[PDB]
């Protein structure tokens, strides 16, 4: 063809775009892609935070300060959830003077989400949390909805309520923020470029989007071990652990993940080890005949998940026992995950 | 037993509607068109192969000049192509690569896309800086963005796996009108030519006609046995076609309020991803999981032709406003232009 001068310059631009696309493509083909799945609150976004902390030198002091309002909001909502559950369960305060504090709590909860935690609100929360009737309700939290980090913050209210409060990395790791849509982070480790994707808030039919992740290197499936004793909801079909098993069954055996490694994070082992001391595993699995030790109960849960694999002879599940908020544990486990990925390809 | 009294009343209303529909089914489209000649030899050839995506292509949309088009791929790129020369005009790097839809604004000033980020991102093609910039991230859906179409530079309609569609004010970033009533993921939407109505197809196996300015569902169309993945208006705006996981396409008429025709072959059992009419409405083009595009005679239901040029699912297609070409986009990372 005999191109005009502007046409020639447009072709030249297109060829430059092509060189960029080719280069981007070479980098992308080297990526190790990790897909984080699991029920809401299983610990997925906490694992993402840990990758930033461990491999991206993330959550500096200055970034941690932006989580102050979230810490406060988590703290306030937790004590409110407990107070509201007392009216529902007919639990009375250990001291009748706390009824005023409870009224004030809802009133002082008209302050915005800023640097709140006025000394007045903090004192109202500290007195309620110390009340024996509130503690009795807190110890029945398996009967309502309550952030797993409730005790963590409320037990540290003195440090947290100081006007010079600077959130720690563990404070940040303990926060609960519900989001929608895919959450992503990238990092380099042992000369592999990792891209980790947390599907996150996704209210839709899995069958319509799961094929998009055909070709990911590995799935990390998070399970909240401590969900095992949660009372059924109003119209809930099965308990939370069985809903997790249903999701895992669907994922592990999906035709689109045939050449994808399945990694199982049996998470919140720290909370599970405390709960199993007082709440038997038969609440979750009525047929369970073992003892309620951490070791036996954790092994049984692992078995229940791994038995869902319909292709045991051709596919292997890599199970880890994790505390997602514990940076050293996640570092050690992800190191092992990485070695397995290296040895397998 | 209030829920009992209501659940039974809906069954009677469905029966009334079925009876009203049967009452005006005085003939079938097939018998009405029996006399007209078949279309015959539809021999379309690939006139262009658009190369440069490096992963599955999930969506495309022609600009209204019938020359530029935008395509969206899981390689994290939104590419605007000059289809006449195959020159890449822009290659836009996406913040999230898990895209499912893109759209070209009729003005040519903006494109949109989105996917598993649950966000409809608006991209300004005419910046002072000379490159393409995200001008808005439309947030508020709680499931994936499955489809979107601009009404003009300040309003856009979206469909989502969260079972809603929404009309957005792009300037303010707010959903200003919502379209609720589907009970399963909404997969696809199509704007009427006058933009006063749009139709949606969902995983409740129904299609719904929506009144844009009133914000409600005018009509609901059933008949499909599985998800409706794709939907497109007939060019005069009085009918539309769907494409389904049940391996059929179907033609629905608005004013007669019912299905008119099914397009299927007994040995075609795979899903349909995409549908489009030719300019006159005579041809219904549909993209299939079996890597082919089938061309149906929309009036007589015979298959007229095949476009077989991809090595993986045909995921999207579109016909230019001037009618001169059809584009196919594919999981095999290529787009092809045919006529």
């Amino acid at each position, epitope marked *: 063809c005999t191109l005009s001068a502007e046409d020639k310059a447009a072709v*030249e631009r297109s060829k430059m775009i092509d060189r960029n696309l080719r280069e981007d493509g070479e980098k992308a083909a080297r990526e190790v892609k990790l897909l984080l799945l699991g029920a809401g609150e299983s610990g997925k976004s906490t694992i993402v935070k840990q990758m930033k902390i461990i491999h991206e030198a993330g959550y500096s002091e200055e970034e941690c300060k932006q989580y102050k309002a979230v810490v406060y909001s988590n703290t306030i909502q937790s004590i409110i959830a407990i107070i509201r559950a007392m009216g529902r369960l007919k639990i009375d305060f250990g001291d009748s003077a706390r009824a005023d504090d409870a009224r004030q709590l809802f009133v002082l909860a008209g302050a915005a989400e800023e640097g709140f935690m006025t000394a007045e609100l903090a004192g109202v929360i500290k007195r309620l949390w110390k009340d024996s009737g509130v503690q009795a309700c807190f110890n029945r939290s398996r009967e309502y909805q309550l952030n797993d980090s409730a005790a963590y913050y409320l037990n540290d209210l003195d440090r947290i309520a100081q006007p010079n409060y600077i959130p720690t990395q563990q404070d940040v790791l303990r926060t609960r923020v519900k989001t929608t849509g895919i959450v992503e982070t990238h990092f380099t480790f042992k000369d592999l470029h990792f891209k980790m994707f947390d599907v996150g808030g996704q209210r839709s039919e899995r069958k319509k989007w799961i094929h998009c992740f055909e070709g990911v290197t590995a799935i990390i499936f998070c399970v909240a071990l401590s969900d095992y004793d949660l009372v059924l909801a109003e119209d809930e079909e099965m308990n939370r652990m069985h809903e997790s098993m249903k999701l895992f069954d669907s994922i592990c055996n999906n035709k689109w993940f045939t050449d994808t490694s399945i990694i199982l994070f049996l998470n919140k082992k720290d909370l599970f080890e405390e709960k199993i001391k007082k709440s038997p595993l038969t609440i979750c699995y009525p047929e369970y005949a073992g003892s309620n030790t951490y070791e036996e109960a954790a092994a049984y849960i692992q078995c229940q998940f791994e038995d869902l694999n319909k292709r045991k002879d051709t596919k292997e599940i890599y199970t880890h026992f994790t505390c997602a908020t514990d940076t050293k544990n996640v570092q050690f486990v992800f190191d092992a995950v990485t070695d397995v990925i290296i040895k397998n390809n | 037993s209030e829920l009992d009294q209501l659940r039974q009343e809906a069954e009677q209303l469905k029966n009334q509607i079925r009876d009203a529909r049967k009452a005006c089914a005085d003939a079938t489209l097939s018998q009405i068109t029996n006399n007209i000649d078949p279309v015959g030899r539809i021999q379309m050839r690939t006139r262009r192969t658009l190369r440069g995506h490096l992963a599955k292509i999930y969506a495309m949309h022609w600009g209204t000049d019938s020359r530029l088009l935008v395509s969206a791929s899981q390689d994290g790129k939104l590419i605007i192509w000059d289809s006449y020369t195959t020159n890449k005009v822009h290659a836009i790097p996406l913040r999230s690569s898990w895209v499912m839809t893109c759209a070209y604004a009729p003005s040519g000033n903006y494109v949109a896309c989105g996917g598993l980020d649950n966000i409809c991102s608006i991209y300004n093609l005419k910046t002072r*800086e*000379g490159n393409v910039r995200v001008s808005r991230e439309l947030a508020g859906h709680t499931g994936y963005l499955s489809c979107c179409r601009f009404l003009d530079d300040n309003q856009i309609v979206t469909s989502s796996g969260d079972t809603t569609c929404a009309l957005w004010d792009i300037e303010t970033g707010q959903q200003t009108t919502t379209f609720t009533g589907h009970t399963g993921d909404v997969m696809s939407l199509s704007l009427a030519p006058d933009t006063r109505l749009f139709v949606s197809g969902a995983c409740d196996a129904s299609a719904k006609l929506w009144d844009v300015r009133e914000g409600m569902c005018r009509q609901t169309f059933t008949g499909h046995e599985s998800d409706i993945n794709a939907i497109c208006f007939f060019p005069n705006g009085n009918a539309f076609a769907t494409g389904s996981d049940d391996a059929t396409c179907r033609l629905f008429d608005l004013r007669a309020d019912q299905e008119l025709m099914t397009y299927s072959h007994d040995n075609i059992i795979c899903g349909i991803t995409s549908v489009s009419f030719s300019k006159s409405g005579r041809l219904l083009l549909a993209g299939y999981d079996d890597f082919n595009c089938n061309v149906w005679d929309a009036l007589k239901a015979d298959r007229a032709g095949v476009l077989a040029g991809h090595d993986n699912r045909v995921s999207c297609l579109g016909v230019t406003d001037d009618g001169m070409a059809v584009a196919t986009g594919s999981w095999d990372s290529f787009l092809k232009i045919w006529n």
Partner: single-chain antibody
Amino acid sequence: DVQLVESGGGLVQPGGSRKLSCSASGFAFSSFGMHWVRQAPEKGLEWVAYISSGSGTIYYADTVKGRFTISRDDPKNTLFLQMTSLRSEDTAMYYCVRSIYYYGSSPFDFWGQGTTLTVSSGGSDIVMTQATSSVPVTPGESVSISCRSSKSLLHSNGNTYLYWFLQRPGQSPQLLIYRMSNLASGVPDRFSGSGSGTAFTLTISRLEAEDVGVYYCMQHLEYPLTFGAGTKLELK
């Protein structure tokens, strides 16, 4: 905010050397082709050199080949013009101009403020013709400026590669029309361009105050790029 700031001008003896610089900010510098256009003291615009985006393509005007070198430093967002063997005919204001080329783009849409260079004492090209050198006008009236080319500027692709610029008194040229009929961004709809092949017309409706200045046409069909002599709009 798009900025192009030329520097390096000054007084130089004939036969000497001088490097001009053009510093870019507020846009994706490396995506744009870049030109140098110069203007002798009481004269029109003359294209000097071009370096494409990516530096793959470089063109010089004949009167400058061998002596001037155009280069760019994309990481430092800078355009250069290295001049040598400076002659008296090089005395001019030197403009840096950005130009991006893709389907539907608007080339030549931003010009720098210019830097002044003064040198002391001691055919096949397309000809663009504006036969009328000046025109007196009164506000509110309607004007028609004319331009002609020695070759057809209408290409087999359908585009006609004709540009109109306005230089207001004391300011840099401003793009008005690209490819004979497209209104540049920010230009009021009272301007419009038309023509066919070898004859073109710029028309202003209800001429306003700011419209006074010199109007140049330019062909972008082929290099060297060439301007008309310019038509001035005087107030009555």
